[PDB]
Structure formats: C-alpha cells, structure tokens
C-alpha cells in the first residue's frame, strides 16, 4: 500500500514533526559554515591548465545594467542557495580523464527523496539537494565534501558558462520548432498553412535520420557560453551574468568557468579552490562591481 510521511500522523503531531525536521536542517547547514576550522584538504596555488569547481545557482530574473560608456546591458540574477560540495571522485576511480566533484544545490524535503539519496546525505550530514551536477577538475583543485560554495567564488570581469534545461514548449509543429516558412494563406492552399512540405526525396524510399519534423521542443539542456560577470552581491549570494541564461525563472543552473579558448588562462586572479569567507582576509564588501559598471549611488555620468 502507498504511504506518505504524514498519512498516519495526528493533528498535533504534524506541526511538531515539521518543526523538528526544519530545525535539524537549519542546524546541519549552520554546522558547515567554517570549513577551514574543520580539517581541510590541502590548498594549492593556481597553475596554468588547472580547472576549478563551479556552482549551482537559482535563476531569480533579469534587470538592466548600465556602463560608463552609456551602453545598456541586460543581466540575469543567479542566486546561490545552499550550494555544497557533495562528492569527490579520483580520475582512476571515475575511469575518466579528470577528477570530478559532485556539487548539489537548493535544499529540498527529506520526505520526498528516495532512501538511497537520504542515506548518502545522512552520511554527509547535510539536508538533501534538488540537483547534483558534476564538475571536471584537476587534482590540485580538490575540495573536501561538505564545504559550502558562495557567489564570491566568481569575480566581476570573469566569463562563465551557464547550463540549464530550456523552457519546455511541449509538442510543436515545424514552424515553431524549426522555423519552417509554411505555406501561403490564400490563393488556394486547401489544408496547407503550417505543414512540413516534402519530408524527403523521391528516390530514397525512406526518411533520413535526424530530419526536422514536429515533436517535443524545449525541456533539454543547453549551454550559454562566454557570459560576463558584471557584479557580485556577497550578502545575498547573487551573480550578475551578461545576457540571458536558458530555462525559466526559479530553475537551477550550472555555472562554471568559460571553456572558450580566449578565456583559457584568465583564472589567475580568481580564488583557486574556492572562496573561503572564514579566512577573513580583506573582508569583501556587499557589492563587487566591474570597472565599467555604473554603480547605483554614483553621480550621473557625463560623456567627457
């Protein structure tokens, strides 16, 4: 028989259980605020060719941003919510080219997770997370699981890649799916307005694999490359990324350093393993801006 958590609970037991589990989650999250005080994995200086871990952020929405030159750039707000390192795998163990870090984001209910996942998080001592994404790293970039990740990991002027599931448009015809021109409205055209024309050629008694036909569009992973980080809000853990990222608002996006060859070795100035707030050397302000960004509270710009 099917069972949910609060099926067999009393009227007064439901609020108690809710409070109990919520408090435990809060405690577990608060426990991990100081990774350096706990026994850390060795921190190495940055080297050319090294790749560091990324983050999982929530797409808040978009706002305009201005520059001193006067150009307006739209930016997307990515909030980092309960982002922790979950798992490390060595290159030999993974049977892959590089070491991997599994990183999770956005805490969710314990009641709605499978036993396997619950057991894994129990061993960690962290509340379960909505999405887990895998980041290919070098050995020198290894971070102990349980370590929190913050928006200040990225810095303004840096370029990032953003990966999310696109907005699902469901089943779509050729015109919305592939931008087929369709057929004219009048001058006949009995039942042909939005139809695919000739699907294939006469001679082949078949249709080629991968022909553009009506089907399900959206709801697939896409990556946006070379998006500039304009601003960090350290208080709320907000990353301001240039332009639009895939997916709906309140979705979870995978943010890593840009893979583009132009921005290959620009990781020199960035905090290598991650940013550790508990280090407390030159405590960062609320807002980190790029040089070009017109900060709010600044005087009105004149083009001199």
């Amino acid at each position: 028989s099917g069972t949910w958590w609060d099926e067999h609970l009393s009227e007064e037991n439901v609020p108690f259980i809710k409070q109990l589990v919520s408090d435990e989650d809060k405690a577990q999250l608060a426990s991990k605020l100081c990774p350096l005080k706990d026994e850390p994995w060795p921190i190495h200086p940055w080297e050319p060719g090294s790749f560091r871990v990324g983050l999982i952020a929530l797409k808040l929405g978009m706002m305009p941003l201005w520059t001193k030159d006067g150009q307006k750039h739209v930016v997307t707000l990515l909030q980092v919510q309960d982002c922790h390192v979950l798992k490390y795998t060595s290159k030999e163990n993974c049977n892959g080219k590089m070491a991997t870090l599994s990183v999770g984001g956005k805490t969710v209910s314990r009641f709605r997770k499978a036993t396997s996942i619950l057991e894994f998080y129990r061993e960690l001592g962290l509340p379960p997370k909505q999405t887990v994404k895998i980041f290919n790293i070098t050995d020198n970039a290894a971070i102990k699981p349980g370590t929190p990740l913050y928006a200040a990991h990225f810095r303004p002027g840096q370029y990032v890649d953003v990966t999310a599931k696109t907005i699902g448009k469901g089943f779509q015809g050729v015109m919305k799916r592939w931008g087929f021109k369709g057929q004219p409205a009048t001058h006949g055209q009995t039942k042909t307005h939005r139809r695919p024309g000739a699907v294939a050629t006469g001679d082949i008694g078949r249709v080629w694999p991968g022909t553009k036909m009506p089907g399900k569009m959206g709801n697939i992973y896409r990556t946006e490359y070379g998006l500039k980080v304009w601003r960090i809000n350290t208080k709320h853990n907000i990353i301001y990324v240039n332009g639009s990222v895939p997916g709906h608002k309140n979705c979870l996006v995978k943010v890593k350093d840009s893979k583009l060859p132009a921005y290959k070795d620009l990781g020199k100035n960035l905090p290598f393993p991650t940013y550790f707030p508990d280090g407390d050397e030159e405590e960062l302000p609320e807002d980190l801006y790029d040089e070009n960004v017109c900060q709010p509270g600044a005087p009105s710009i004149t083009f001199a």
Binding site: L9, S10, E12, N13, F16, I167, K169
Partner: protein, 152 residues
C-alpha cells in the same frame, strides 16, 4: 503552450464560462452545499470567497452591491449574502468554503466534488479525519516530543 494560465476554458466561451460559474455560485448561496463536476467546482471556489469579501465590504457600498447584483441571479439572495453569510465569517479572514471529492457520477463517470459554505445548518459531511493521537506511531512521537521539551 499554457504556462501561467490560471483559468479553465469551459462552456461555449468566456461569457458562457462566467454564466456557468454564476449559476453554480447562485446555487451555492441558496443551498449552502452544491454537487457539481470537480473542475467546475474548483473554478467556482475562488469566486465564492471573493463574493464573501464583497459581502463583508458592506450593504451600503455601491461597488459591492453592483458585484452582488451581477453574481446573484436570484435577487432574494442578495440580502442573504449581506445579512447572513457576511456576518457569519466576520471573525475569519478567509477559507469560507470547503471542497471535497465525491464518487464519480453514474452516467458519464465524471470526477465530482461537493462544495459547501462553512457553518451551514445542514448535516455534516463525512470529512476525512487524521489518525487518533492514541495510535502507536503517535504515542512514540509524543514520547519524543516530551523528551525534547524535557531536554530544554
């Protein structure tokens, strides 16, 4: 695509949808308990609470009166809304209606729902009730609650 579409498409169109909901709402005000298809009931529910809010807004208010005149086809119900239903709910800020799924209709096997205004004179529904506190699981958890409060 229908992302963020909040209203169902029912009847012969938009006006027809309003008219269908209006009839269900009139039925509810008169009878205080209505059986109807689940989706139609769910659609009407929102309007039911909004009507009570306008009822609360006052008899003398012209805006509320206009709304009440529209939504109640039978005019005798308009006093009832202002003088019976609105004073009843003066204490609470919402949750005026109660909706419960009913066994499917005989003829067309439609999903069905009962909607009532709370505190009606009619015999109480066989509402679903959570398990007693004296059950084994509830006893164990009561023990846990006691231990936690003793710890503090």
């Amino acid at each position: 695509i229908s992302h963020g579409r909040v209203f169902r498409r029912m009847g012969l169109g938009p006006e027809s949808r309003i008219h269908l909901l209006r009839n269900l709402l009139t039925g509810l005000v008169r009878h205080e308990r209505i059986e109807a298809p689940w989706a139609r009931v769910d659609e009407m529910r929102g309007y039911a609470e909004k009507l009570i809010d306008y009822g609360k807004l006052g008899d003398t208010n012209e805006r509320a009166m206009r709304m009440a005149d529209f939504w109640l086809t039978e005019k005798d119900l308009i006093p009832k809304l202002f003088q019976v239903l609105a004073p009843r709910y003066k204490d609470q800020t919402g949750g005026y209606t109660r909706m419960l799924q009913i066994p499917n209709r005989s003829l067309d096997r439609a999903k069905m729902a009962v909607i009532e205004y709370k505190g009606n004179c009619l015999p109480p529904l066989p509402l679903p009730r959570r398990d007693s506190h004296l059950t084994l699981l509830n006893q164990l958890l009561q023990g846990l609650r006691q231990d936690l409060r003793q710890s503090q």
